[PDB]
PDB file of all heavy atoms in Angstrom:
ATOM      1  N   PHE X 112      40.238  61.180  32.438  1.00 15.60           N
ATOM      2  CA  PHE X 112      40.275  59.786  32.029  1.00 15.60           C
ATOM      3  C   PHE X 112      40.595  58.903  33.232  1.00 15.60           C
ATOM      4  O   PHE X 112      41.419  59.262  34.067  1.00 15.60           O
ATOM      5  CB  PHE X 112      41.318  59.580  30.934  1.00 15.60           C
ATOM      6  CG  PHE X 112      41.245  58.234  30.285  1.00 15.60           C
ATOM      7  CD1 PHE X 112      40.723  58.096  29.014  1.00 15.60           C
ATOM      8  CD2 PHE X 112      41.688  57.104  30.949  1.00 15.60           C
ATOM      9  CE1 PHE X 112      40.645  56.859  28.417  1.00 15.60           C
ATOM     10  CE2 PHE X 112      41.614  55.868  30.354  1.00 15.60           C
ATOM     11  CZ  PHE X 112      41.087  55.745  29.085  1.00 15.60           C
ATOM     12  N   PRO X 113      39.941  57.740  33.328  1.00 15.01           N
ATOM     13  CA  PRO X 113      40.128  56.867  34.486  1.00 15.01           C
ATOM     14  C   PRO X 113      41.600  56.596  34.790  1.00 15.01           C
ATOM     15  O   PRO X 113      42.437  56.545  33.885  1.00 15.01           O
ATOM     16  CB  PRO X 113      39.401  55.578  34.071  1.00 15.01           C
ATOM     17  CG  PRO X 113      39.178  55.719  32.587  1.00 15.01           C
ATOM     18  CD  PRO X 113      38.966  57.166  32.391  1.00 15.01           C
ATOM     19  N   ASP X 114      41.891  56.422  36.074  1.00 18.19           N
ATOM     20  CA  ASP X 114      43.258  56.310  36.572  1.00 18.19           C
ATOM     21  C   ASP X 114      44.048  55.130  35.997  1.00 18.19           C
ATOM     22  O   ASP X 114      45.114  55.316  35.410  1.00 18.19           O
ATOM     23  CB  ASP X 114      43.228  56.212  38.101  1.00 18.19           C
ATOM     24  CG  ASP X 114      44.596  55.964  38.696  1.00 18.19           C
ATOM     25  OD1 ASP X 114      45.577  56.572  38.220  1.00 18.19           O
ATOM     26  OD2 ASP X 114      44.686  55.163  39.651  1.00 18.19           O
ATOM     27  N   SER X 115      43.531  53.918  36.168  1.00 17.45           N
ATOM     28  CA  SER X 115      44.298  52.722  35.830  1.00 17.45           C
ATOM     29  C   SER X 115      43.632  51.827  34.783  1.00 17.45           C
ATOM     30  O   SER X 115      44.309  51.052  34.112  1.00 17.45           O
ATOM     31  CB  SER X 115      44.571  51.910  37.097  1.00 17.45           C
ATOM     32  OG  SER X 115      43.414  51.832  37.906  1.00 17.45           O
ATOM     33  N   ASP X 116      42.314  51.932  34.646  1.00 19.23           N
ATOM     34  CA  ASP X 116      41.572  51.087  33.714  1.00 19.23           C
ATOM     35  C   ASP X 116      41.917  51.402  32.262  1.00 19.23           C
ATOM     36  O   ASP X 116      42.516  52.436  31.965  1.00 19.23           O
ATOM     37  CB  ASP X 116      40.067  51.276  33.919  1.00 19.23           C
ATOM     38  CG  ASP X 116      39.635  50.996  35.341  1.00 19.23           C
ATOM     39  OD1 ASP X 116      40.459  50.459  36.112  1.00 19.23           O
ATOM     40  OD2 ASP X 116      38.472  51.314  35.682  1.00 19.23           O
ATOM     41  N   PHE X 117      41.534  50.500  31.363  1.00 21.09           N
ATOM     42  CA  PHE X 117      41.584  50.756  29.927  1.00 21.09           C
ATOM     43  C   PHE X 117      40.167  50.954  29.382  1.00 21.09           C
ATOM     44  O   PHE X 117      39.183  50.601  30.034  1.00 21.09           O
ATOM     45  CB  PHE X 117      42.236  49.590  29.188  1.00 21.09           C
ATOM     46  CG  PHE X 117      43.731  49.549  29.304  1.00 21.09           C
ATOM     47  CD1 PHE X 117      44.344  49.381  30.531  1.00 21.09           C
ATOM     48  CD2 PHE X 117      44.526  49.645  28.173  1.00 21.09           C
ATOM     49  CE1 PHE X 117      45.729  49.328  30.631  1.00 21.09           C
ATOM     50  CE2 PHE X 117      45.910  49.590  28.265  1.00 21.09           C
ATOM     51  CZ  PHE X 117      46.512  49.437  29.495  1.00 21.09           C
ATOM     52  N   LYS X 118      40.071  51.518  28.182  1.00 20.35           N
ATOM     53  CA  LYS X 118      38.791  51.691  27.517  1.00 20.35           C
ATOM     54  C   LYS X 118      38.968  51.487  26.019  1.00 20.35           C
ATOM     55  O   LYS X 118      40.059  51.667  25.490  1.00 20.35           O
ATOM     56  CB  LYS X 118      38.228  53.087  27.782  1.00 20.35           C
ATOM     57  CG  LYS X 118      37.879  53.367  29.233  1.00 20.35           C
ATOM     58  CD  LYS X 118      36.775  52.462  29.734  1.00 20.35           C
ATOM     59  CE  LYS X 118      36.341  52.858  31.130  1.00 20.35           C
ATOM     60  NZ  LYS X 118      35.791  51.702  31.891  1.00 20.35           N
ATOM     61  N   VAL X 119      37.891  51.122  25.335  1.00 20.73           N
ATOM     62  CA  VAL X 119      37.949  50.910  23.899  1.00 20.73           C
ATOM     63  C   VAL X 119      37.253  52.065  23.179  1.00 20.73           C
ATOM     64  O   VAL X 119      36.134  52.446  23.533  1.00 20.73           O
ATOM     65  CB  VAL X 119      37.306  49.581  23.519  1.00 20.73           C
ATOM     66  CG1 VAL X 119      37.707  49.187  22.103  1.00 20.73           C
ATOM     67  CG2 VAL X 119      37.723  48.511  24.503  1.00 20.73           C
ATOM     68  N   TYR X 120      37.924  52.615  22.169  1.00 20.81           N
ATOM     69  CA  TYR X 120      37.490  53.848  21.523  1.00 20.81           C
ATOM     70  C   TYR X 120      36.701  53.566  20.259  1.00 20.81           C
ATOM     71  O   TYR X 120      37.251  53.087  19.271  1.00 20.81           O
ATOM     72  CB  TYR X 120      38.705  54.705  21.183  1.00 20.81           C
ATOM     73  CG  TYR X 120      38.377  56.102  20.702  1.00 20.81           C
ATOM     74  CD1 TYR X 120      37.530  56.932  21.424  1.00 20.81           C
ATOM     75  CD2 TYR X 120      38.938  56.598  19.532  1.00 20.81           C
ATOM     76  CE1 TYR X 120      37.239  58.213  20.985  1.00 20.81           C
ATOM     77  CE2 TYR X 120      38.658  57.877  19.089  1.00 20.81           C
ATOM     78  CZ  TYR X 120      37.811  58.681  19.817  1.00 20.81           C
ATOM     79  OH  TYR X 120      37.541  59.953  19.368  1.00 20.81           O
ATOM     80  N   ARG X 121      35.410  53.881  20.302  1.00 20.92           N
ATOM     81  CA  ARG X 121      34.497  53.633  19.192  1.00 20.92           C
ATOM     82  C   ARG X 121      35.033  54.165  17.862  1.00 20.92           C
ATOM     83  O   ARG X 121      34.788  53.573  16.809  1.00 20.92           O
ATOM     84  CB  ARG X 121      33.135  54.261  19.502  1.00 20.92           C
ATOM     85  CG  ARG X 121      32.197  54.360  18.316  1.00 20.92           C
ATOM     86  CD  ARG X 121      31.746  52.998  17.861  1.00 20.92           C
ATOM     87  NE  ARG X 121      30.752  53.089  16.795  1.00 20.92           N
ATOM     88  CZ  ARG X 121      31.038  53.046  15.496  1.00 20.92           C
ATOM     89  NH1 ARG X 121      32.296  52.914  15.091  1.00 20.92           N
ATOM     90  NH2 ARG X 121      30.060  53.135  14.603  1.00 20.92           N
ATOM     91  N   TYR X 122      35.766  55.275  17.907  1.00 19.17           N
ATOM     92  CA  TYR X 122      36.186  55.954  16.684  1.00 19.17           C
ATOM     93  C   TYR X 122      37.663  55.767  16.374  1.00 19.17           C
ATOM     94  O   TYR X 122      38.202  56.411  15.478  1.00 19.17           O
ATOM     95  CB  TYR X 122      35.816  57.433  16.749  1.00 19.17           C
ATOM     96  CG  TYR X 122      34.325  57.627  16.671  1.00 19.17           C
ATOM     97  CD1 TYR X 122      33.577  57.924  17.807  1.00 19.17           C
ATOM     98  CD2 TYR X 122      33.657  57.470  15.466  1.00 19.17           C
ATOM     99  CE1 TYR X 122      32.203  58.089  17.735  1.00 19.17           C
ATOM    100  CE2 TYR X 122      32.290  57.629  15.384  1.00 19.17           C
ATOM    101  CZ  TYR X 122      31.568  57.940  16.518  1.00 19.17           C
ATOM    102  OH  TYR X 122      30.207  58.095  16.422  1.00 19.17           O
ATOM    103  N   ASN X 123      38.304  54.870  17.113  1.00 19.32           N
ATOM    104  CA  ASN X 123      39.655  54.434  16.795  1.00 19.32           C
ATOM    105  C   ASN X 123      39.794  54.109  15.310  1.00 19.32           C
ATOM    106  O   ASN X 123      38.930  53.469  14.726  1.00 19.32           O
ATOM    107  CB  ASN X 123      40.010  53.199  17.617  1.00 19.32           C
ATOM    108  CG  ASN X 123      41.397  52.687  17.319  1.00 19.32           C
ATOM    109  OD1 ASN X 123      42.385  53.204  17.833  1.00 19.32           O
ATOM    110  ND2 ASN X 123      41.481  51.656  16.496  1.00 19.32           N
ATOM    111  N   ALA X 124      40.889  54.553  14.707  1.00 20.63           N
ATOM    112  CA  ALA X 124      41.083  54.445  13.263  1.00 20.63           C
ATOM    113  C   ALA X 124      40.821  53.051  12.701  1.00 20.63           C
ATOM    114  O   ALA X 124      40.329  52.915  11.578  1.00 20.63           O
ATOM    115  CB  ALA X 124      42.493  54.885  12.904  1.00 20.63           C
ATOM    116  N   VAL X 125      41.154  52.020  13.472  1.00 17.64           N
ATOM    117  CA  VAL X 125      41.051  50.641  12.982  1.00 17.64           C
ATOM    118  C   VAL X 125      39.730  49.965  13.348  1.00 17.64           C
ATOM    119  O   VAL X 125      39.202  49.179  12.571  1.00 17.64           O
ATOM    120  CB  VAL X 125      42.212  49.784  13.511  1.00 17.64           C
ATOM    121  CG1 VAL X 125      41.944  48.312  13.262  1.00 17.64           C
ATOM    122  CG2 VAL X 125      43.517  50.211  12.859  1.00 17.64           C
ATOM    123  N   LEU X 126      39.201  50.282  14.525  1.00 17.84           N
ATOM    124  CA  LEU X 126      37.964  49.681  15.006  1.00 17.84           C
ATOM    125  C   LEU X 126      36.746  50.324  14.351  1.00 17.84           C
ATOM    126  O   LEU X 126      35.714  49.686  14.182  1.00 17.84           O
ATOM    127  CB  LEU X 126      37.848  49.834  16.524  1.00 17.84           C
ATOM    128  CG  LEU X 126      38.774  48.984  17.398  1.00 17.84           C
ATOM    129  CD1 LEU X 126      38.321  49.033  18.849  1.00 17.84           C
ATOM    130  CD2 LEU X 126      38.799  47.557  16.906  1.00 17.84           C
ATOM    131  N   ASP X 127      36.874  51.595  13.985  1.00 21.97           N
ATOM    132  CA  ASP X 127      35.734  52.373  13.514  1.00 21.97           C
ATOM    133  C   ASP X 127      35.005  51.668  12.375  1.00 21.97           C
ATOM    134  O   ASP X 127      33.799  51.447  12.457  1.00 21.97           O
ATOM    135  CB  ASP X 127      36.184  53.768  13.075  1.00 21.97           C
ATOM    136  CG  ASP X 127      35.040  54.750  13.001  1.00 21.97           C
ATOM    137  OD1 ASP X 127      33.874  54.299  13.039  1.00 21.97           O
ATOM    138  OD2 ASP X 127      35.308  55.974  12.910  1.00 21.97           O
ATOM    139  N   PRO X 128      35.733  51.301  11.307  1.00 25.37           N
ATOM    140  CA  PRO X 128      35.059  50.655  10.175  1.00 25.37           C
ATOM    141  C   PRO X 128      34.441  49.312  10.562  1.00 25.37           C
ATOM    142  O   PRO X 128      33.405  48.940  10.017  1.00 25.37           O
ATOM    143  CB  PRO X 128      36.188  50.450   9.153  1.00 25.37           C
ATOM    144  CG  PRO X 128      37.309  51.324   9.605  1.00 25.37           C
ATOM    145  CD  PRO X 128      37.187  51.400  11.093  1.00 25.37           C
ATOM    146  N   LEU X 129      35.069  48.602  11.495  1.00 25.97           N
ATOM    147  CA  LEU X 129      34.608  47.278  11.890  1.00 25.97           C
ATOM    148  C   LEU X 129      33.336  47.332  12.736  1.00 25.97           C
ATOM    149  O   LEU X 129      32.421  46.545  12.520  1.00 25.97           O
ATOM    150  CB  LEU X 129      35.702  46.538  12.656  1.00 25.97           C
ATOM    151  CG  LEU X 129      37.038  46.369  11.933  1.00 25.97           C
ATOM    152  CD1 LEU X 129      37.984  45.526  12.778  1.00 25.97           C
ATOM    153  CD2 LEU X 129      36.842  45.745  10.567  1.00 25.97           C
ATOM    154  N   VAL X 130      33.279  48.246  13.702  1.00 25.81           N
ATOM    155  CA  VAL X 130      32.097  48.378  14.552  1.00 25.81           C
ATOM    156  C   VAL X 130      30.942  48.947  13.734  1.00 25.81           C
ATOM    157  O   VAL X 130      29.768  48.739  14.053  1.00 25.81           O
ATOM    158  CB  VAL X 130      32.358  49.278  15.771  1.00 25.81           C
ATOM    159  CG1 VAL X 130      31.084  49.472  16.566  1.00 25.81           C
ATOM    160  CG2 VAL X 130      33.433  48.681  16.649  1.00 25.81           C
ATOM    161  N   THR X 131      31.281  49.672  12.675  1.00 26.42           N
ATOM    162  CA  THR X 131      30.280  50.180  11.752  1.00 26.42           C
ATOM    163  C   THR X 131      29.671  49.026  10.971  1.00 26.42           C
ATOM    164  O   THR X 131      28.500  48.703  11.152  1.00 26.42           O
ATOM    165  CB  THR X 131      30.882  51.196  10.766  1.00 26.42           C
ATOM    166  OG1 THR X 131      31.042  52.465  11.418  1.00 26.42           O
ATOM    167  CG2 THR X 131      29.980  51.360   9.546  1.00 26.42           C
ATOM    168  N   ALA X 132      30.478  48.406  10.111  1.00 24.32           N
ATOM    169  CA  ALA X 132      30.035  47.282   9.289  1.00 24.32           C
ATOM    170  C   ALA X 132      29.177  46.300  10.086  1.00 24.32           C
ATOM    171  O   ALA X 132      28.148  45.824   9.599  1.00 24.32           O
ATOM    172  CB  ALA X 132      31.236  46.568   8.693  1.00 24.32           C
ATOM    173  N   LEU X 133      29.606  46.009  11.311  1.00 24.01           N
ATOM    174  CA  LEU X 133      28.886  45.095  12.187  1.00 24.01           C
ATOM    175  C   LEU X 133      27.479  45.607  12.461  1.00 24.01           C
ATOM    176  O   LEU X 133      26.494  44.919  12.198  1.00 24.01           O
ATOM    177  CB  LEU X 133      29.635  44.917  13.512  1.00 24.01           C
ATOM    178  CG  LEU X 133      28.853  44.163  14.590  1.00 24.01           C
ATOM    179  CD1 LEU X 133      28.514  42.763  14.105  1.00 24.01           C
ATOM    180  CD2 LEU X 133      29.627  44.115  15.899  1.00 24.01           C
ATOM    181  N   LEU X 134      27.392  46.818  12.997  1.00 24.17           N
ATOM    182  CA  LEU X 134      26.103  47.411  13.322  1.00 24.17           C
ATOM    183  C   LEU X 134      25.199  47.473  12.094  1.00 24.17           C
ATOM    184  O   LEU X 134      23.974  47.405  12.210  1.00 24.17           O
ATOM    185  CB  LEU X 134      26.297  48.807  13.921  1.00 24.17           C
ATOM    186  CG  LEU X 134      26.652  48.830  15.412  1.00 24.17           C
ATOM    187  CD1 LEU X 134      26.798  50.245  15.920  1.00 24.17           C
ATOM    188  CD2 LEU X 134      25.600  48.086  16.220  1.00 24.17           C
TER     189      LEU X 134
END
Side-chain angles (χ1 to χ4, degrees):
Chain X
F112 191 106
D114 175 41
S115 44
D116 304 349
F117 283 63
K118 295 297 186 207
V119 196
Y120 189 52
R121 167 68 175 94
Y122 291 103
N123 179 81
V125 168
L126 288 192
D127 198 347
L129 303 184
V130 176
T131 282
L133 170 60
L134 279 181

